[PDB]
Amino acid sequence: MSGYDRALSIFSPDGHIFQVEYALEAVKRGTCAVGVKGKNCVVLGCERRSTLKLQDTRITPSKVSKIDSHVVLSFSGLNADSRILIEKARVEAQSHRLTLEDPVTVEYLTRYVAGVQQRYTQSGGVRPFGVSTLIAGFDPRDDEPKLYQTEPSGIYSSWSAQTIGRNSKTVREFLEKNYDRKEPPATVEECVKLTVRSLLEVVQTGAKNIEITVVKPDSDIVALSSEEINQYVTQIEQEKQEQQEQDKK
Amino acid sequence: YSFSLTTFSPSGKLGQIDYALTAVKQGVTSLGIKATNGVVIATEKKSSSPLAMSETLSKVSLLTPDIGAVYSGMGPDYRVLVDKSRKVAHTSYKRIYGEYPPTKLLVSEVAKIMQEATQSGGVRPFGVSLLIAGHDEFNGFSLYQVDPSGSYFPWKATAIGKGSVAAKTFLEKRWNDELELEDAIHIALLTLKESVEGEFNGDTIELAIIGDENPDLLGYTGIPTDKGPRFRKLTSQEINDRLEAL
Amino acid sequence: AGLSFDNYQRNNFLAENSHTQPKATSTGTTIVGVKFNNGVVIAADAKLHRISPKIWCAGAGTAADTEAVTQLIGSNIELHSLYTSREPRVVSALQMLKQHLFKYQGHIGAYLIVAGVDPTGSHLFSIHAHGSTDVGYYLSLGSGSLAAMAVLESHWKQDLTKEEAIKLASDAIQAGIWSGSNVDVCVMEIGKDAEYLRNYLTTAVLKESIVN
Amino acid sequence: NDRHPLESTLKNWETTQRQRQMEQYRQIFGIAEPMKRTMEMEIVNRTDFNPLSTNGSIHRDILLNKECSIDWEDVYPGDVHSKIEKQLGI
Amino acid sequence: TTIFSPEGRLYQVEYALESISHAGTAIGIMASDGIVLAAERKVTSTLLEQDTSTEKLYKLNDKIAVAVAGLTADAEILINTARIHAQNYLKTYNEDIPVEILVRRLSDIKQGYTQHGGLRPFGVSFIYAGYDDRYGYQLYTSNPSGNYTGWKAISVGANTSAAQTLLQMDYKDDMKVDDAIELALKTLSKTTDSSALTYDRLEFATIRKGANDGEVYQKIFKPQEIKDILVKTGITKKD
Amino acid sequence: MDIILGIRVQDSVILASSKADDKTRQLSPHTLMSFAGEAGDTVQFAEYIQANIQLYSIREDYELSPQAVSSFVRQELAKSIRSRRPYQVNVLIGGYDKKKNKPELYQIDYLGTKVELPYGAHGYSGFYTFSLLDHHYRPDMTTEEGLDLLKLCVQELEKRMPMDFKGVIVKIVDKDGIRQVDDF
Amino acid sequence: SINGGIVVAMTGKDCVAIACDLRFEKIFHYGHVFLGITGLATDVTTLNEMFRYKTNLYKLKEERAIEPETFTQLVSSSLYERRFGPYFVGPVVAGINSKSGKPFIAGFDLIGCIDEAKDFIVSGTASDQLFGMCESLYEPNLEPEDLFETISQALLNAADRDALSGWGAVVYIIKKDEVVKRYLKM
């Protein structure tokens, strides 16, 4: 469907080079968003572009967005679109409980989101959303961490770790070496440390650019502050000095 | 579904509206002047034949008893806006507040109608620029211009159509902040005397004022509370008498 | 859109369950009409309304509804006068008023006597709240209508002048007398403005605070 | 029921009066006249979408013969994505 | 026609952003005790009515104001929608609308006009200003894309880049509203295309607290008040 | 039965609601409503209110003042009667205003009538609670004095109506958010 | 919360007044125009919300505050809209033309018929005790202090003299450039 496969030269059908491919191009240009599972948590992390000197930090939105007391969403691609995509998911979840005496399931928050994205692909000269998302959390009455990715076409998939946006090859390469699916990070601290190491390779400057949200069972949602992720960054940088000086020559 | 009109041209321009301002720029000139105690709006009547009876083609129009309008551009577009503008004054404001809307609230509503025609599939923007002039108890006398874009502007004086740049230069040269309504009438009659395509007399020229209240034109006595129309359309004999003072 | 029934069921439980629903004000008093020589007089004992300068009404039944319909139709008559470039005819207002009273099925409780001058001449009609119509040289509505009609018939003759019509109008009103209680009249005469004629006949403990 | 006698009549008045008019034009002028008038109204309604304006349309008042007439419904009137995905189908 | 460029970028939004890049400059600055808004107005018309009550600057409710770069015809549709939403919130909650809820409300409508192909986007950039108890004095910006951002000082429209550099070097977190008056006037005089700043070319406003503990007050300055801050500041085009 | 009682104190609001579902909904970390009435309409109306305030709290990452939830509750109660014969409903909203450090109490009737209260009741009471409350009530009453006033008030209700009401659930809003307190 | 209650309104030389029962005022204001509403308390509060909304939007759209006579036409046309199921109220508008200085008082039935008495206005159940007191105590062209005196003694005398421990009255006295709210207790 692309590149050097061409019978009697070639000509195009209705097919591949299409609005949804250009929405995938918009997603790749948006900041890096990562998520990793643990034994009994899931951590989502994002790249802030380094804030401008006149920007107002106390009111700046947390990039990782809570959809409900047990569900978290982060994105890469178009911010305006993600704001319109989070609103639909939030009201969809609040409406779920009001009509089903049941909080929304993480898998229904992923099928709905990718589902609405698919309808703006299908037809009408309404464009698809220039957005790809991580959806993470827990179901109610369960202790299994969940983590889904959705794409502009409305395709979605489950991951034990994933990355989307800028430079995400290099991050997925690091995760494939550092995330073992038999023995995932056994504690929240190690899960957070793995996301800070993962992001430290791709972020612009350092602790400014990382921001993380930790989801735990029973609605224990918890953003980490700048000061908490500065002590993770500093501990990881201490271990780099220790590893270098533990050279034997 | 690849459906809209008046989309953006790469230099940050709306295009179709630009072509709609070329239709306005081709019309018989109209103009307006604000004075200390009144306002004037004026235009020429261009006959399709000298067998036509231009007592039927009014160009200067009453919107409410204190508000007048005139156009340059496509007259058909102006007959349809004027009747929506009249309906708006009654339905939005008179029937809620028991008093007619100001000349800033009715100009906003006319402009909202012209903006909706730019931002649509299926419809071209209007081929008219409208001058709307009037009085209100708290704003006082006012004059506004509205263009195919739905942009509206408050003016001290203005002109639109073929002769508009020479008219606007004469209006800058002659306008001062102490004019009275008889003075503004003379300046407006002087300005149309340069822009006239045909003959100049009381039959070819349209001229209206919003001035003092005229209790004669209310057509019923007994209610001083009701002051009587500020808007008055000059009779063809008054225009010929003032055109004898020229 | 229009007149809503939002608290219709809400007020069907309030009256049932002992809140006195506020009294709608009613003008039950005498109203008359006079197709006098070269014009038409109407009178009532706040109560005389204009559909346009040359067309006026007197109202009976609910006060708010007589004002409300005459002001709605006065808007449509003004817009139609602007649309057609012609003075508004009494038959056009009568058609609008009567056709509007019919859409509302007499739940708009306006009973109305309509008079005016137009390019055709001088006209006089009356509409009941279910949207049905009378015509005559003289008409009367309200509680004193028996006595008023006896006086109207007893003295009307062709070529009644202004002064004599105004006397008959005022005597048919005063025959309704033994809210309201002195004459307002309007006189519509074919060459002339509608002439409207009003009334033709240490203690306690204080604290205080300043506010804007 | 407890519901006002006039409510269902005034709810459907605008539709009922045009539906009744189209049947008179079918009868007096033949099927071509309401086929013409319904297609003009279809072009005007279907090519005139703007999520922030709900206050009718200028040409629909010309077509409907409402260009100089006020009802109580015109003086007393009564999400852009929800409008978009209704106009296009969901 | 709301289709993506092959880079995943929207041609219409870029052309609407080219349009506002001509559309007159506006500065907003957030002091420790109030917000300042200022805008520069190209009065090339003698007969245009200066001392008209608004063009660039507008009230959205009793504690929120905006500056406009872009088409004023487009801006007034959004401004009315925001005014309706502010009063509909006040009617519902009996409380004045929080600034974030309203700024992002106008950012959600402006994104919709960029997705459906029957609609052109809105050619407008807004520098919002206001007070509420949830945060305090807040300064936000929103643009034709539906993006919005929080700032301590920002410019929109023409000459944004020169203005941002001038803000950045003189802004202090602890400055008072009268220092922000001075700064916004200096910045505009150091950014203007016109030879010197004057009271009719300038639209001004403030969001102070005053003397009385419950007050927040939004003086949208009349021309004579602007002449006083001009002659006090040393811009002082004075006899 | 369906009784609701209220005894707001210097630094708390105490909501007592009849034992049977609680018929009192946590709207936020510092707001309770209690409600009484026709069991179908009130339970469904309370869940509609809760879903709208949960949606606000998630959408903002913020709390909604006890005033603003109350005026929202009156506006939605009034808006639900504009096509309907009035259902029997009474709402007693108590919450803690964390931007002014005051506990607050509001009552809303079926007609949508807000009143801001020291103390309140509905459903199954006469002047016996209101006289007993007005004699003993104080602006600066402590939470322990408030629980004793509520015990006196429940005892007065029990003495006058010796049938089995299975006691009542008591709940407190203060600086520490919702506390369910055991009382008998 | 108490349903019903009374409002009274009165004119003086360049001044107005609005008395009302306390023991939540019936009397709201929208800039220099005051609105005392009697009747069902839900409709009094729903009308306060509705007129606050309409009048804030008016001030925003029109660059000036709503005058007493304009507000009279707005309250009557808004009340009339509710024709088949009205607001169970007796509104009493008041206010001093900001461009004239003339006192204005008006009052309405539940669908908006305008009274415009030049002396005094009453609203609420058992009005006609106060109508007699107010007609007995009124005189034309008072000063503001005598105008306060006549309206306050009308409220006191027509008051239930059996329950005067449950009393409390708010009297707004409204002038051209000044408004004083006196609360008044026995």
Curated annotation (Swiss-Prot), chain D:
Other noteworthy facts: Present with 2740 molecules/cell in log phase SD medium.
GO terms of biological process kind = DNA damage response; proteasome assembly; ubiquitin-dependent protein catabolic process
Please give the positions of the paired cysteines in each disulfide bond.
none
Q: Which gene encodes it?
A: UMP1
Arranged from A to Z, the UniProt key words for this protein are: Chaperone
Q: Coverage of the whole protein, first to last residue?
A: 48 to 148 of 148
Q: What is the organism of origin for this protein? A: Saccharomyces cerevisiae (strain ATCC 204508 / S288c) (Baker's yeast)
Post-translational changes noted in the entry:
Seems to be degraded by the proteasome upon its formation.
**What name does the UniProt record give this protein?**
Proteasome maturation factor UMP1
Q: Which family does it belong to?
A: Belongs to the POMP/UMP1 family.
Entry superkingdom: Eukaryota
Function noted in UniProt: Short-lived chaperone present in the precursor form of the 20S proteasome and absent in the mature complex. Required for the correct assembly and enzymatic activation of the proteasome. Also prevents premature processing of the PRE2 propeptide.
Q: Which GO terms describe its cellular component?
A: cytoplasm; nucleus
From Swiss-Prot, chain E:
Q: Name one GO biological process term.
A: proteasome core complex assembly
Output the PROSITE patterns linked to this UniProt entry. PROTEASOME_ALPHA_1, PROTEASOME_ALPHA_2
Q: Which CDD domains match?
A: proteasome_alpha_type_4
Q: Does the keyword Nucleus apply?
A: yes
Quaternary structure, per UniProt, is: The 26S proteasome consists of a 20S proteasome core and two 19S regulatory subunits. The 20S proteasome core is composed of 28 subunits that are arranged in four stacked rings, resulting in a barrel-shaped structure. The two end rings are each formed by seven alpha subunits, and the two central rings are each formed by seven beta subunits. The catalytic chamber with the active sites is on the inside of the barrel.
Explain the purpose of this protein: The proteasome degrades poly-ubiquitinated proteins in the cytoplasm and in the nucleus. It is essential for the regulated turnover of proteins and for the removal of misfolded proteins. The proteasome is a multicatalytic proteinase complex that is characterized by its ability to cleave peptides with Arg, Phe, Tyr, Leu, and Glu adjacent to the leaving group at neutral or slightly basic pH. It has an ATP-dependent proteolytic activity.
**UniProt similarity note:** Belongs to the peptidase T1A family.
Name assigned to this protein = Proteasome subunit alpha type-3
Give the taxonomic lineage as stored in the record: Eukaryota, Fungi, Dikarya, Ascomycota, Saccharomycotina
The gene that this protein is the product of is PRE9
UniProtKB/Swiss-Prot annotation, chain F:
Q: Name one GO biological process term.
A: proteasome-mediated ubiquitin-dependent protein catabolic process
N-acetylmethionine modification, residue list: M1
Keywords tagged on the record: Acetylation, Cytoplasm, Nucleus, Phosphoprotein, Proteasome
- The Phosphoserine modification is found at S65
**Functional description taken from the UniProt entry:** Non-catalytic component of the proteasome which degrades poly-ubiquitinated proteins in the cytoplasm and in the nucleus. It is essential for the regulated turnover of proteins and for the removal of misfolded proteins. The proteasome is a multicatalytic proteinase complex that is characterized by its ability to cleave peptides with Arg, Phe, Tyr, Leu, and Glu adjacent to the leaving group at neutral or slightly basic pH. It has an ATP-dependent proteolytic activity. This subunit has a chymotrypsin-like activity.
* Recorded GO CC terms: cytosol; endoplasmic reticulum membrane; nucleus; proteasome complex; proteasome core complex, beta-subunit complex
- Its recorded name reads Proteasome subunit beta type-4
Q: Which Pfam families match?
A: Proteasome
Q: How does it assemble?
A: The 26S proteasome consists of a 20S proteasome core and two 19S regulatory subunits. The 20S proteasome core is composed of 28 subunits that are arranged in four stacked rings, resulting in a barrel-shaped structure. The two end rings are each formed by seven alpha subunits, and the two central rings are each formed by seven beta subunits. The catalytic chamber with the active sites is on the inside of the barrel.
- Quote the subcellular location field of this record: Cytoplasm; Nucleus
The organism's place on the tree of life at top rank: Eukaryota
UniProtKB/Swiss-Prot annotation, chain G:
Q: Protein name, please?
A: Proteasome subunit beta type-3
List the GO molecular function terms.
endopeptidase activator activity
Point out the cross-link Glycyl lysine isopeptide (Lys-Gly) (interchain with G-Cter in ubiquitin) in this chain.
K54
The superkingdom listed in its UniProt entry is: Eukaryota
Listed under GO cellular component are: cytosol; nucleus; proteasome complex; proteasome core complex, beta-subunit complex
Complexes and interactors: The 26S proteasome consists of a 20S proteasome core and two 19S regulatory subunits. The 20S proteasome core is composed of 28 subunits that are arranged in four stacked rings, resulting in a barrel-shaped structure. The two end rings are each formed by seven alpha subunits, and the two central rings are each formed by seven beta subunits. The catalytic chamber with the active sites is on the inside of the barrel.
| Single biological process term from Gene Ontology | proteasome-mediated ubiquitin-dependent protein catabolic process
The UniProt keyword set, sorted, is: Cytoplasm, Isopeptide bond, Nucleus, Phosphoprotein, Proteasome, Ubl conjugation
Kindly list the places in or outside the cell where this protein is found, as annotated in its UniProt entry. Cytoplasm; Nucleus
Q: InterPro entries from the xrefs?
A: Ntn_hydrolases_N, Proteasome_beta_3, Proteasome_bsu_CS, Proteasome_sua/b, Proteasome_suB-type
Question: What family does the entry list?
Answer: Belongs to the peptidase T1B family.
Pfam families from the xrefs?
Answer: Proteasome
Please tell me the species this chain comes from: Saccharomyces cerevisiae (strain ATCC 204508 / S288c) (Baker's yeast)
